[PDB]
Structure 1
Amino acid sequence: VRPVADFSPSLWGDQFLSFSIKNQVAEKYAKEIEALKEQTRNMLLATGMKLADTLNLIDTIERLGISYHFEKEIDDILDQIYNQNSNCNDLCTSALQFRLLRQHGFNISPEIFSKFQDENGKFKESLASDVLGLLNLYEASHVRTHADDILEDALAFSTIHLESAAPHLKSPLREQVTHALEQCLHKGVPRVETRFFISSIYDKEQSKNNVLLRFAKLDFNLLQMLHKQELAQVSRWWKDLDFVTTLPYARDRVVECYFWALGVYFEPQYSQARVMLVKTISMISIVDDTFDAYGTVKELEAYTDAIQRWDINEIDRLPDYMKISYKAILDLYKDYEKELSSAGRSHIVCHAIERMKEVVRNYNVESTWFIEGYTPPVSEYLSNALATTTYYYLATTSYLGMKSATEQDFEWLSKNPKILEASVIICRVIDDTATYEVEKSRGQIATGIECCMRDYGISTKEAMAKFQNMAETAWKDINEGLLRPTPVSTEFLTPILNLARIVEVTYIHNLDGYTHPEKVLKPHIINLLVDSIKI
């Protein structure tokens, strides 16, 4: 016998199965974008700009999702700002300067916020009537590190007053503030925040810059075309496998998986990386379902071993259905090796593989704990549950398609650097807070919050609160890990960051976790992969 198949079909159908680029439009957009690209550049390279105007300019270009065209110009400008470390005396500009620098690795001192606090060390209540200042302080409070205790109350301060003033603010500011209170910029998925900013805010700004707005809308729509091609290509791939019929117990969420990959990196140069990444997320999805929604203690034990040995010869050692899965997994990695041959980078594929073996080992342990009704101590729980988030694995995977990834980068990653650990913790801890009830009602007493309660002898509330501070501490670690000098180039840190951002966005709703599939993601998928921004 097997467990009752619940998982419902993909509410997407074949919307993405086939998409044909309109080359006429693509070139038209590309061609004009090129022009707008140079106009914008000259805006950045312009001399005699005030500090406030330069920062607002960088900020706007970043929120518009077009800053990836000016990585160097923006860096040079911020570098120069960091060194001359001149002091503007208004909250708004100081909080912005602080955020932009810190997000870019410049360890600017949080001492810049001293002039805004009293002797006691708390923010001057007299700032409560400066909305723009409160807003930028709010966004800034989210990039603090363990050494920014000066900003310990910045979040509660800016929050309370922003909530209070919001109802009477003019649009789009009102919407910008309300949105920020629901999702800070630093911890949001880049494409999602860019889509919202472009069409809900900047397109309605009275003072909007038309060149920047047009540039932003065209670029976003153009990249979307690329994304739709990829998702189409990946959708055909998923169809050929046909697990929907061979492995009926498995969920069909390739679209949701693509969204995840898109959140890791959206730039066109990462097109190959994205395709490779989504294929892996989809594949490891089957394995998860197989472990906790179908396979028996005995089959899983054999599956785990087959994965560790990793050789087709083991396929016969597995039951018929696990053969479909297993065979598909091996071929996938064989495809990766073939894709990287061109650039002679097939030798890194093994790193992703050892990470998958790790995920499978821990899944198996997870079920063994389930079967025995074992409720481990938090430490033992995390030693296993961290890897089952698959984050070490996805992070490793995201490097595969990155042309610039070197063995050194993978070596650094293999040691579980602090920035990656933090990202993993955030996923684990946020998931456990969101999926406690459900898993608890299925006998999964080896669930995070559970272990925490028994371990510490505290209520479900104190346990979730404990987990929140872990997520909080973890975010501080991520922010610290982005400060220069970085152990690897920032290009390889951003994906870890983005993985954590995906977490915050997929479980924004702890009030139910909200059926991850449909709810939560559906809106974003429609906004990033279905509807183009109306010009």
Structure 2
Amino acid sequence: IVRPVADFSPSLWGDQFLSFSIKNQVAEKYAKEIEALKEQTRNMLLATGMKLADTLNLIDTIERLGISYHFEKEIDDILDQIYNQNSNCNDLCTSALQFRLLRQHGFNISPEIFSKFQDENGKFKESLASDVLGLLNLYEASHVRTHADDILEDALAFSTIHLESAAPHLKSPLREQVTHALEQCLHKGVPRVETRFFISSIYDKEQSKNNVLLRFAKLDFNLLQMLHKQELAQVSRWWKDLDFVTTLPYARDRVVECYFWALGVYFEPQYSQARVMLVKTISMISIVDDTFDAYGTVKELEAYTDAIQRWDINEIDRLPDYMKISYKAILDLYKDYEKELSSAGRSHIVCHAIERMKEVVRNYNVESTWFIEGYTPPVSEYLSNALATTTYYYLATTSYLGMKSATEQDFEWLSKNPKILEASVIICRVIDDTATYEVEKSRGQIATGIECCMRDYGISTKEAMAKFQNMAETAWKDINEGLLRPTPVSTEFLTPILNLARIVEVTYIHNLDGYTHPEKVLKPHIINLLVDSIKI
């Protein structure tokens, strides 16, 4: 009877993913060759009498090529040997790479390694300003700082300014790699995205590439992409048979972008079931955010919220017709989840996701009420509600549903809101509010968290946005600290939370709503990961 209309742009993909016939002959050919190159590479790693720097370059290259998930053991064993040896008689380049690789893998190497490259003020020696490879590796390393690493405080600023100064005169592909790093650092990037770029734009054009590794990475990428395309087809069909495109026209039609999201959380083959479960959840809760924001009268959203808490088809008759559509879809979804996990006896664990979703829906209704009433809460009260509305507690919990190694102890840990999870949630919230403002406010909004922060601290819109971006930086330090050993749960269950944070940085790069406006940002990513193969 109202009714908003956000004039949302419609899917730009149409039919093109709906049907994918895997060429089983080609798939077997790639798998055949890859097995050979895998052992060729495993033996590269197990080689002895290698220099520290050669070893680190090898691992770095393998990781960036996106084929390191084949060698978790090997790479672990090497980094552990390096961590425990205390070698540090090296140059900036090697020291910074050593720092980053060990930190990314949970090894708490001391940042004292950088002391020889600084003066008595802890500022980096400007004499290093012409070691471009050293600057490059420091830049990268500077993004894995924790709160205990204040010695690295100058690293980003210092490395950045001299990389920018150097870049135009560098040879290719190094120039392209510097320019790219300045725009998207490795640590905070989505792995498949960074890998596609590296393989195709950098390593393939290096004078000195290892041909075995190059071939390995191209084949493995193109091969996993076939699986991804199968999943998206299967998911596109699921979505199309739901026809929310017409029966729920008010919502954003973005299931492909949702798949990209799930692919960001994990790309590995063994997580196929998990990806498919996750993306269904992502796109489904996306419908709900679109009902509480626009098209949602306070009256109507109330009954829905009560229906979700009670969680029972018997309550559909209490709902407006269009809300019935969404609500049986949700309940049906969770019974699918139950039967899909029925075989593995892991059926019971579904209720962890459900309770998180109830939590999300509850806080959606608060947010709605705040707009209609026009209530601009204190920023503290605002976050105690807005954190869950990111859906990230919920997505994190969902991402475990498909992982077969996930035990109840894992869910119990996740349920207590661990610091790594909250940091990821915080990064999503503050970056969303910076980037999707004003989108929002362009639906005449006033409930926005930015406007809270302005009214609360008596500060300008630009000022508030900074202080928010700052909260994101603090939270990255807590994510990096969350990965350090001993870890509260297996690294396997930490990486999806890290990847959730990465997806935020990537989707809202340059402060734009990449999800609502996939055009500029996400479309290229989707094309490179899901449409175009790597030319062999």
Q: TM-score, normalised by structure 2?
A: 0.99
Shift of 1:250: 1.9
Other structure's SS at 1:241 match: coil
Shift of 1:533: 0.4
Other structure's SS at 1:3 match: coil
Identity %: 100
**Aligned residue in 2 for 1:494:** 495
Shift of 1:513: 6.0
> Distance between the aligned counterparts of 2:329 and 2:509, measured in 1?
33
Shift of 1:296: 1.4
> Distance between the aligned counterparts of 1:385 and 1:214, measured in 2?
46
Checking the alignment, whether the CA contact within 8 Å between 1:507 and 1:516 is kept in structure 2 is no
> Distance between the aligned counterparts of 1:384 and 1:502, measured in 2?
22
**Aligned residue in 2 for 1:33:** 34
Checking the alignment, whether the CA contact within 8 Å between 1:103 and 1:143 is kept in structure 2 is yes
> Distance between the aligned counterparts of 2:137 and 2:90, measured in 1?
14
Checking the alignment, whether the CA contact within 8 Å between 1:506 and 1:516 is kept in structure 2 is no
Give the number of equivalent residue pairs.
535
> Distance between the aligned counterparts of 1:476 and 1:104, measured in 2?
15
- Please list the CA deviations of residues 317-374 of structure 1 after superposition, one character each: whole Å capped at 9, or x if unmatched: 1111111110010000000000111111011100100010111111110110000000
Shift of 1:517: 2.4
- Please list the CA deviations of residues 269-309 of structure 1 after superposition, one character each: whole Å capped at 9, or x if unmatched: 00000000000011101111111121311110000000000
Provide structure 1 residue ranges, at least 5 long, that are not aligned to the other structure.
none
> Distance between the aligned counterparts of 2:346 and 2:519, measured in 1?
37
> Distance between the aligned counterparts of 2:148 and 2:463, measured in 1?
26
- Please list the CA deviations of residues 96-148 of structure 1 after superposition, one character each: whole Å capped at 9, or x if unmatched: 00000000000000000000001121111000000000000000000000000
Checking the alignment, whether the CA contact within 8 Å between 1:370 and 1:443 is kept in structure 2 is no
Question: Structure 1 residues 512, 261: closer, same or farther in 2, change over 3 A?
Answer: closer
Other structure's SS at 2:438 match: helix
Question: Structure 1 residues 421, 143: closer, same or farther in 2, change over 3 A?
Answer: same
Question: Which range moves more in the overlay, 278-287 or 459-468?
Answer: 459-468
Other structure's SS at 1:17 match: coil
> Distance between the aligned counterparts of 2:214 and 2:270, measured in 1?
23
- Please list the CA deviations of residues 179-227 of structure 1 after superposition, one character each: whole Å capped at 9, or x if unmatched: 0000000000000000000000000000000000000000000000000
Question: Which range moves more in the overlay, 237-246 or 197-206?
Answer: 237-246
Checking the alignment, whether the CA contact within 8 Å between 1:436 and 1:448 is kept in structure 2 is no
> Distance between the aligned counterparts of 2:391 and 2:158, measured in 1?
36
Question: Which range moves more in the overlay, 307-316 or 456-465?
Answer: 456-465
> Distance between the aligned counterparts of 1:85 and 1:496, measured in 2?
30
> Distance between the aligned counterparts of 1:33 and 1:514, measured in 2?
35
Checking the alignment, whether the CA contact within 8 Å between 1:36 and 1:211 is kept in structure 2 is yes
Question: Which range moves more in the overlay, 153-162 or 290-299?
Answer: 290-299
Checking the alignment, whether the CA contact within 8 Å between 1:482 and 1:490 is kept in structure 2 is yes
Other structure's SS at 1:228 match: helix
Checking the alignment, whether the CA contact within 8 Å between 2:514 and 2:522 is kept in structure 1 is no
Shift of 1:88: 2.9
- Please list the CA deviations of residues 68-112 of structure 1 after superposition, one character each: whole Å capped at 9, or x if unmatched: 000000000000000001113200000000000000000000000
Shift of 1:5: 5.9
> Distance between the aligned counterparts of 1:511 and 1:287, measured in 2?
22
Question: Which range moves more in the overlay, 430-439 or 116-125?
Answer: 430-439
> Distance between the aligned counterparts of 2:505 and 2:121, measured in 1?
33
Question: Structure 1 residues 334, 512: closer, same or farther in 2, change over 3 A?
Answer: closer
Checking the alignment, whether the CA contact within 8 Å between 2:507 and 2:521 is kept in structure 1 is yes
1:17-32 alignment, distance < 5 Å? 17-32=18-33
- Please list the CA deviations of residues 394-441 of structure 1 after superposition, one character each: whole Å capped at 9, or x if unmatched: 000000000111111011000110000000000000011112223234
> Distance between the aligned counterparts of 2:516 and 2:439, measured in 1?
11
**Aligned residue in 2 for 1:247:** 248
> Distance between the aligned counterparts of 1:242 and 1:462, measured in 2?
43
> Distance between the aligned counterparts of 2:517 and 2:75, measured in 1?
36
Other structure's SS at 1:128 match: helix
CA RMSD in angstroms comes to 1.0
Other structure's SS at 2:202 match: helix
Shift of 1:515: 4.8
Other structure's SS at 1:48 match: coil
> Distance between the aligned counterparts of 1:56 and 1:154, measured in 2?
21
Shift of 1:252: 1.4
Question: Which range moves more in the overlay, 289-298 or 363-372?
Answer: 289-298
1:211-360 alignment, distance < 5 Å? 211-360=212-361
> Distance between the aligned counterparts of 2:331 and 2:26, measured in 1?
40
> Distance between the aligned counterparts of 1:243 and 1:466, measured in 2?
38
**Aligned residue in 1 for 2:520:** 519
Checking the alignment, whether the CA contact within 8 Å between 2:8 and 2:516 is kept in structure 1 is no
Shift of 1:510: 1.2
Question: Which range moves more in the overlay, 515-524 or 170-179?
Answer: 515-524
Shift of 1:251: 2.0
Shift of 1:511: 5.9
Other structure's SS at 2:224 match: helix
Checking the alignment, whether the CA contact within 8 Å between 1:435 and 1:513 is kept in structure 2 is no
Checking the alignment, whether the CA contact within 8 Å between 2:106 and 2:484 is kept in structure 1 is yes
Other structure's SS at 1:421 match: helix
Checking the alignment, whether the CA contact within 8 Å between 1:432 and 1:449 is kept in structure 2 is yes
Other structure's SS at 2:304 match: helix
Q: TM-score, normalised by structure 1?
A: 0.99
Checking the alignment, whether the CA contact within 8 Å between 1:106 and 1:483 is kept in structure 2 is yes
> Distance between the aligned counterparts of 1:305 and 1:206, measured in 2?
63
Shift of 1:442: 2.9
> Distance between the aligned counterparts of 1:510 and 1:246, measured in 2?
32
